[PDB]
Amino acid sequence: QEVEFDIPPQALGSALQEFGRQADIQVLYRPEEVRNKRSSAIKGKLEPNQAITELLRGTGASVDFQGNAITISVAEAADSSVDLGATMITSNQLGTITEDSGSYTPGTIATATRLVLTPRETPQSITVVTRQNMDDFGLNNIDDVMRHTPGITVSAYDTDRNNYYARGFSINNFQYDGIPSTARNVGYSAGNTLSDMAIYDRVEVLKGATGLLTGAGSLGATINLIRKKPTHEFKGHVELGAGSWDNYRSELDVSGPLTESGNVRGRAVAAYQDKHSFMDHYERKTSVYYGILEFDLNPDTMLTVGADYQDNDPKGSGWSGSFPLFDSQGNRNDVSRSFNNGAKWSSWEQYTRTVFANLEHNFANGWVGKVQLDHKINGYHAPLGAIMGDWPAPDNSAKIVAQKYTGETKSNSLDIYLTGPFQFLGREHELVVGTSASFSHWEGKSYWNLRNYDNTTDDFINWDGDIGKPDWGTPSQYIDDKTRQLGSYMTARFNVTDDLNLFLGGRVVDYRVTGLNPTIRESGRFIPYVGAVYDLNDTYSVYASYTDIFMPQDSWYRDSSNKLLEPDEGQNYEIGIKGEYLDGRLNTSLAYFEIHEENRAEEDALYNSKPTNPAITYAYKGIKAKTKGYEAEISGELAPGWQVQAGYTHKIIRDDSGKKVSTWEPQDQLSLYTSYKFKGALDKLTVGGGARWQGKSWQMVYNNPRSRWEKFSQEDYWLVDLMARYQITDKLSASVNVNNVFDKTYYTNIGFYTSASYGDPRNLMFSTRWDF
C-alpha cells in the first residue's frame, strides 16, 4: 500500500539505501553493478513498486520483488553462467524483517558472520522462528519459541527456569539485536529463559559453535532475538487473549512517523499477562514495555535510542522440580500433575531492562558503519521455599528448604563494526571488521541462616503450599563478580568463482573475571572461522565449515592441584547441502555435524573419594567429549497458501568415559508445524496444526534411602498442536489455539536434584487481535 517518498538523484548505491529506508524494505544489490550509475528523482506518496521502477529509470536494472525484500540486478546481453552467491550489499544490517512476510522461513540473516546473507549463503546450521509462526502458534515467550524450534529440546529446572539443548549442550549464549549478553551463570542471566515475544520480530538460532560473534560462550548454539523496529507508515494492533487456568494476556503495538516528514519515527509496545497454571498454587504476572525512536540526522546517518523492560513476577515458585522422586523410604512417588512443591509465598521474580543507542552511517563508498551502546540490567528477588528431600515420610510429613537470593547485574557494552565490498582479482568480495567491549557487574545478597523457623509440614499428599514464611535473618553472603570481555573480529567473504564462496575470519578475545574469586584471565585467545559454499545448480549448494568457541570455566572448576581447568572449548565440523526453491520462498537443508569438546569439567571420582590436598575439597578433571549427528530441515511455502517449518535432528554425545552424556536430551527428535490459508469462499480462514516427537530419554539418579543408582526413562512421545484463525473483518480477527491435543502426560525434568517436572497438559488459548 501507498508510501511517502523523497529520494533525489544520487549514486544508485545511496539511492538504494535511501529507498530501503523510506520503504521499510530490504534492498539487496550488487555493488559492482550499480557503481557508475544514478537514480532518477522520486517524489511523494507512491506505491513502493511504482516508486522503485521510477527510481531505477535509466539505470538498466530490474527488480525481483521478494516479500519484505527486493533484489536489484542489471542483466547484460553477455552472462557466461550465473553467480548465485554474488556479493550483495544490503540496506538493513540485521537482515529481512519477517513481520508481514506471511512466511515461516526467514529472508536474510546476519547471525553467522555479521554479513547480510541468505540461509543458502550461510555455511552454518541456521534456524529461524519467524514473526508469523509466532503469531499463528501463540508463542508468546522464548520458552514457547524454543519448544517449537527445530533441533531444540526444552527441559525444566523449575517453574521459572527452563533449559535449552542443542547438539549435546546447554545453550547459554543469547543476543539482542546481535549484541551478546553475559550469561556465565544464573546471576548474570536473570530472565533469559522468560523474554516476552511482544517486542521481537523474530528469533534466530545459530547451532554449532558460535564463537565468531558470541565471543566466549557455550557449545550448541546462540539464540539471537531481533527487536521490532518503527516504520514510515503509521500502524498498530491491540490483542486480547484468554487460556486454560485463568491465563489472560493483552498486548498493544504502535509504530510510525512522529513528524510531518518522517525523519523521526517511533515504535512502542506494552504487553501484560497474569496467569495461573495447571500446577497447584502457582501464578505469574509478566509486564513488558518497549520504546524505540529513530532519528535521521541526514539521509545517510541514523540515530536510534530505545528502552525495554520486562518483569517476571511469580508466586509458588519452586527451587528444583515439581516434586521429589523418592519418598522417605525410597519408593518412587506418584502425584497428580497439579502437584507443586513450592510454597505459596515462594517466588523467583526476575527482571530485565535495557537502554540502548546506536548510530549507523553509510559511507558513500558502499561501506556502512555502526556503533552500538548498551546498558542492561538483569535482576532477581528470589525468596524460594519448596519441599525438598526424600519425602513424604511414612506419617505423611515433609520438610521445606527455604533460601533467599536477591541481586542485580548491570552490563555496559560498546560494539563497533565496518562492512563493505572490495575488488580483488577482478571479482567482488566483502568484509566485516569490528571490535567489542562489555563490562558487567553482578552484586547480590544471599540468605540461608534462618532464625527460628520450623520447616516441617504435616500433610504431603495434600500439600497446598500453605506453610509459614521464615525469618531470613541477616545476609549470609555478598556477591561481587565483574566480567570484562574485549573482542575484535574479521570475516572476509571471497567470491572465488561463480560457484564458490570462501569464508575466512576469526575473533581475538580477552576475558577477565574479577571479584570474590581468584581472577580468571584469558588474553589474546584466537577463534578461527573457515567456511565454504559450492553451488551445484540453480537449486542446491553444498557447504562445509570449521567453527570454534570457548568459555573460561566457573571458578569452582579446579583440579587436584587447586588449579582452574583450562577453558571449556569446542570445534564444530559441519558439512551439508542446502536447497533453495521458489525464489527463496522455500528453504531446505540436510546437515552432518560433529562437535569436538575439550576441557569439559568432570567430577574426579578417585580424588573426591577422599580429598588429600587440603587446599581443594572437591576437584574436577578436564576431559574431552564428542557429538556426532545430523539434521534435516524445511521452511516456507509448500504451496500457495501453505506454509511449514520442520526438522529432524539425530545426536549422540559421548565423553571420555566412553559413556553417553546429555542422556536427557533425546537422541532423535522431529518437529513439523504448518498452517494453510484457504482460497475463495473461505479465504478469511487459516487452519494449522503441528506435531513434535522425541525418542527415549533417561537420567541416572541416586536413590539415597536404598543406596542404589536407578535409571529413569521418558519413553518416546508425541505432542500435537492445532490452530485456527478467522479474519472476520479488515481490522479484526479471532484465533483459537489448542495445545497438546491428546493430553499426553509426560516429563520435562527427571533427576535435577532428585526431583521431577511434568510438561503442560492440554491447554487452550483464545484471542482477538485488532489492527488499526
Ligand X SMILES: CCCCCCCCOCCOCCOCCOCCOCCO
- The distance of closest approach from Cβ of residue 736 to ligand X in the complex, given in angstroms and rounded to an integer, is 5
Q: Does 725 bind ligand X (CB under 6 A)?
A: no
- The distance of closest approach from Cβ of residue 424 to ligand X in the complex, given in angstroms and rounded to an integer, is 43
User: Which range binds ligand X by CB under 6 A, 118-126, 166-174, 318-326, 761-769?
Assistant: 761-769
Least Cα distance to 333 among 709, 712, 696, 716 occurs for: 712
- The distance of closest approach from Cβ of residue 310 to ligand X in the complex, given in angstroms and rounded to an integer, is 15
Residue closer to ligand X, measured from CB, 309 or 422 = 309
- The distance of closest approach from Cβ of residue 235 to ligand X in the complex, given in angstroms and rounded to an integer, is 9
Q: Does 234 bind ligand X (CB under 6 A)?
A: yes
Q: Which of 238, 305, 691, 720 binds ligand X (CB under 6 A)?
A: 305
- The distance of closest approach from Cβ of residue 280 to ligand X in the complex, given in angstroms and rounded to an integer, is 16
CA distances to 396, 592, 724 from 719, rounded to whole Å, are 35, 26, 17
Q: Does 766 bind ligand X (CB under 6 A)?
A: yes
DSSP 143: H
Q: Does 151 bind ligand X (CB under 6 A)?
A: no
Helix (H), strand (E), coil (C) string for 480-513? EEEEEEEEEEEEEEEECCCCEEEEEEEEEEEEEE
- The distance of closest approach from Cβ of residue 466 to ligand X in the complex, given in angstroms and rounded to an integer, is 26
User: Which range binds ligand X by CB under 6 A, 250-258, 317-325, 378-386, 653-661?
Assistant: 250-258
Q: In whole angstroms, what separates CA 619 from the centre of its chain? A: 33
Q: Which of 60, 256, 579, 611 binds ligand X (CB under 6 A)?
A: 256
Q: Does 255 bind ligand X (CB under 6 A)?
A: yes
Q: Does 582 bind ligand X (CB under 6 A)?
A: no
Q: Does 266 bind ligand X (CB under 6 A)?
A: yes
Least Cα distance to 767 among 252, 242, 137 occurs for: 242
Which residues have a Cβ under 8 Å from the Cβ of 59 and sit 6 or more positions away?
Answer: 12, 34, 37, 38, 39, 40, 74
Q: Which of 283, 522, 738, 753 binds ligand X (CB under 6 A)?
A: 738
Contact 748, 758 (CB under 8 A): yes
Separation between Cα atoms, residue 336 and residue 758, nearest integer Å:
9
For Cα atoms 2, 98, 160, give the angle at the middle one, nearest 5 degrees.
Answer: 135
Residue closer to ligand X, measured from CB, 357 or 536 = 357
Q: Give the binding-site size for ligand X (rule: CB under 6 A).
A: 20
Residue closer to ligand X, measured from CB, 285 or 762 = 762
Residue closer to ligand X, measured from CB, 601 or 738 = 738
Helix 48-55, helix 12-23: angle, nearest 10: 170
User: Which range binds ligand X by CB under 6 A, 110-118, 427-435, 448-456, 734-742?
Assistant: 734-742
- The distance of closest approach from Cβ of residue 390 to ligand X in the complex, given in angstroms and rounded to an integer, is 32
Helix (H), strand (E), coil (C) string for 386-431? EECCCCCCCCCCEEEEEEEEEEEEEEEEEEEEEEEEEECCCCEEEE
Q: Does 250 bind ligand X (CB under 6 A)?
A: no
User: Which range binds ligand X by CB under 6 A, 28-36, 108-116, 210-218, 252-260?
Assistant: 252-260
Q: Which of 28, 88, 225, 268 binds ligand X (CB under 6 A)?
A: 268
Instruction: Tell me the three state secondary structure of residue 55.
Output: helix
- The distance of closest approach from Cβ of residue 308 to ligand X in the complex, given in angstroms and rounded to an integer, is 9
Q: Does 686 bind ligand X (CB under 6 A)?
A: no
Place of cell 503441528: 690
Which residues have a Cβ under 8 Å from the Cβ of 533 and sit 6 or more positions away?
Answer: 85, 120, 121, 123, 500, 501, 503, 541, 542, 543
Q: Does 295 bind ligand X (CB under 6 A)?
A: no
- The distance of closest approach from Cβ of residue 291 to ligand X in the complex, given in angstroms and rounded to an integer, is 3
List binders of ligand X among 319-358 (CB under 6 A). Answer: 355
Q: Which of 143, 313, 734, 753 binds ligand X (CB under 6 A)?
A: 734
Residue closer to ligand X, measured from CB, 393 or 738 = 738
Q: Does 651 bind ligand X (CB under 6 A)?
A: no
Contact 243, 277 (CB under 8 A): no
Residue closer to ligand X, measured from CB, 356 or 405 = 356
User: Which range binds ligand X by CB under 6 A, 19-27, 467-475, 512-520, 731-739?
Assistant: 731-739
Contact 57, 14 (CB under 8 A): no
Q: Which of 60, 291, 369, 468 binds ligand X (CB under 6 A)?
A: 291
Contact 695, 670 (CB under 8 A): no
Residue closer to ligand X, measured from CB, 534 or 766 = 766
What are the grid coordinates assigned to 461, written together?
A: 499428599
User: Which range binds ligand X by CB under 6 A, 477-485, 553-561, 621-629, 732-740?
Assistant: 732-740
- The distance of closest approach from Cβ of residue 745 to ligand X in the complex, given in angstroms and rounded to an integer, is 11
- The distance of closest approach from Cβ of residue 19 to ligand X in the complex, given in angstroms and rounded to an integer, is 22
Q: Which of 254, 433, 500, 530 binds ligand X (CB under 6 A)?
A: 254
Separation between Cα atoms, residue 646 and residue 104, nearest integer Å:
10
List binders of ligand X among 457-496 (CB under 6 A). Answer: none
DSSP 41: P
Using the Cα atoms of residue 182, residue 186, residue 188 and residue 191 in order, give the sign of their dihedral.
positive
Radius of gyration of the chain (CA): 27
Q: Does 544 bind ligand X (CB under 6 A)?
A: no
User: Which range binds ligand X by CB under 6 A, 38-46, 319-327, 607-615, 733-741?
Assistant: 733-741
H-helix or E-strand spanning residue 533: strand 520-535
H-helix or E-strand spanning residue 142: helix 142-147
Least Cα distance to 17 among 509, 364, 297 occurs for: 364
Separation between Cα atoms, residue 29 and residue 10, nearest integer Å:
16
Q: Does 242 bind ligand X (CB under 6 A)?
A: no
Separation between Cα atoms, residue 297 and residue 263, nearest integer Å:
8
Q: Does 252 bind ligand X (CB under 6 A)?
A: no
User: Which range binds ligand X by CB under 6 A, 248-256, 322-330, 489-497, 679-687?
Assistant: 248-256
Q: Does 138 bind ligand X (CB under 6 A)?
A: no
Which residues have a Cβ under 8 Å from the Cβ of 425 and sit 6 or more positions away?
Answer: none
Residue closer to ligand X, measured from CB, 355 or 437 = 355
User: Residue 359, Cβ neighbours under 10 Å: how many?
Assistant: 17
Instruction: Give the footprint of ligand X on this chain (CB under 6 A).
Output: 234, 254-256, 258, 266-268, 291, 293, 305-307, 355, 734, 736, 738, 762, 766, 768
